[PDB]
Design a protein around this ligand. Structure first.
Ligand code: SJF
Ligand code: SJF
Lengths: 306, 306
């Protein structure tokens, strides 16, 4: 038993992490087969960072301008191209540690592991959710750009996130691995801001099921509610609407615990209207919304990855 | 910016994880050079698990009884010996992925990363603290024994924990890598229990400094307090006494933020006496005590590992 914010083992990604330096900018790149992926703003310098034109900036670059460092081995760049907001640096060497992988784009509400890197070297790993407003509450300092977010699905790494920037509230924005930003953000210094977030309702319910599985039961009740009546409460407390599909996805957890999904909604309602009254749930005094139903099933049943 | 419960990159440990099967028991082993380390209770079966005599049980074993599986390669056991509560299985092959390592024993209050494994395959990674009562609040299911806890110090893995068991409150107990239990626990089914815990005071203060570094300032005050007067409050709220050495260790964080350690203590006092009044600190509605001063400095300055 126990329930922890658990990241995927990072080894497969660690072997793909490289250093990319161009001009005065050093960031991280992702080396898969003979391509290194990195944020395109590496080709910028200070004055370039207000209103850049990256097509103009890229045509002025040379392969030899890109210093790519895989540990203590320099990788010769032999081609480069821009794909949206990522740069694809073709290098003369395929990464022998390339795992099976996919580039996937995730939905707000879904979670992933971030391997925070500096200078191509992994610093730490942690779990994140894509917020409804397409930001992530990460932990990122200067030089962390190009760190990736990912899931692992048996032996296959699904890369979903590459880090580009921090917003004024201290949250983080980036792209999928095809270079397309999550949310309405651009890789420029503008006055852009996150915009209002909501709590991921289905995830909160998943975490309540994790709590029941782990022996926290105090918030349970005999009450029930309709899906419509629950969503009128969710709206007031700035929770995402719960769909019938969310109810279906919570089925297995409902079955294991014997608590109907709509019954757990009634519990959530009471927690929203009354608070926790000094109690905790799974060591939290807040309703936690960064575990998906899958995350709960994964942890509470012991799925591994080969 | 941002602050996350961050684990170390797990790759170096992942390459050491193997499966050990003996009889009806399958657990994880740690393969370093030509030795596999695993919990000695692998040599037990159901009836063996009440009041065992492991010296008796081990002399009845044969090298060939130990099925050691490194991925899809079976490792031939050529010797075995007991060291306290761990078994050392000598195998005919040195692990080519053996990192530089040390066996270290940690102090309550210190943190480490756990690579949760099943069947020798990594499932997830998360950060833990050694509680003052020598338990850890982990996430462990049947088959997770032999998973290790560790820190990474540049390129060197300091293994500090191997998992053996869960206690009736859902917390976890285990040994250092020399087989010596953390705390007054034994690898038997007895009525043993954790025993009363305390909150790791120096860590809470570290996390308050992390909050200030990250722009959470609402809990700060002009007040100060003496170390003695703070500790009279700490005792009432079941917090560990703060020592002058703790104050010294918090020096660098005090210097970076400009908040005297004893001033931050005064803030903690007020949080203890008054609660948080609906506010959060670093996304928590609880005072968090599983970040050490080192963890905070590490994350808020970007230390990596090569
Ligand atoms: C890339 O390493 C870096 C990552 C940032 C730095 C601080 N936290 C992060 O996650 N990205 C940036 O510096 C990007 C840069 C590329 C696109 C736009 C431009 C500006 N920017 C920002 O992240 C701006 O916010 C910001 C906040 C705090 C700090 Cl210290 C900095 Cl350097 C930037
Ligand atoms: C080893 O894989 C296993 C890990 C346990 C299992 C559940 N959570 C864990 O962390 N260890 C044990 O099963 C040990 C075993 C070796 C020493 C004593 C004996 C009993 N025990 C326990 O952990 C007893 O507690 C316990 C609680 C809940 C469950 Cl499902 C189980 Cl199997 C054991």
């Amino acid at each position: 038993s126990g329930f922890r914010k658990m990241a995927f083992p990072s080894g497969k990604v660690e072997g793909c992490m490289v250093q990319v330096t161009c001009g005065t900018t050093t960031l991280n790149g992702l080396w898969l087969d003979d391509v290194v992926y990195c944020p395109r703003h590496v080709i910028c310098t200070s004055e370039d960072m207000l209103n850049p034109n990256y097509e103009d900036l890229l045509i002025r670059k040379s392969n030899h301008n890109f210093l790519v460092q895989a540990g203590n081995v320099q990788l010769r760049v032999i081609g480069h191209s821009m794909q949206n907001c990522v740069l694809k640096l073709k290098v003369d060497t395929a990464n022998p540690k390339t795992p099976k992988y996919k580039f996937v784009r995730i939905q707000p509400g879904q979670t992933f592991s971030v391997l925070a890197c500096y200078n191509g070297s992994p610093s730490g790993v942690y779990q994140c959710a894509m917020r409804p407003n397409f930001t992530i509450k990460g932990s990122f300092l200067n030089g962390s750009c190009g760190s990736v977010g990912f899931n692992i699905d048996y032996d296959c790494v699904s890369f979903c996130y590459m880090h580009h920037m921090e917003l004024p509230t201290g949250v983080h924005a980036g792209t999928d691995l095809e270079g397309n930003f999550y949310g309405p953000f651009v890789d420029r210094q503008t006055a852009q801001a996150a915009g209002t977030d909501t709590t991921i309702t289905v995830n909160v319910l998943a975490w309540l099921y994790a709590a029941v599985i782990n022996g926290d039961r105090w918030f349970l009740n005999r009450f029930t509610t309709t899906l419509n009546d629950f969503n009128l409460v969710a709206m007031k407390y700035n929770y995402e609407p719960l769909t019938q599909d969310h109810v279906d996805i919570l089925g297995p957890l409902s079955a294991q615990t014997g608590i109907a999904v709509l019954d757990m909604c009634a519990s959530l309602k009471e927690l929203l209207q009354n608070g926790m009254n000094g109690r905790t749930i799974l060591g939290s005094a807040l309703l936690e919304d960064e575990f998906t139903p899958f995350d709960v099933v994964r942890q509470c049943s012991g799925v591994t990855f080969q």
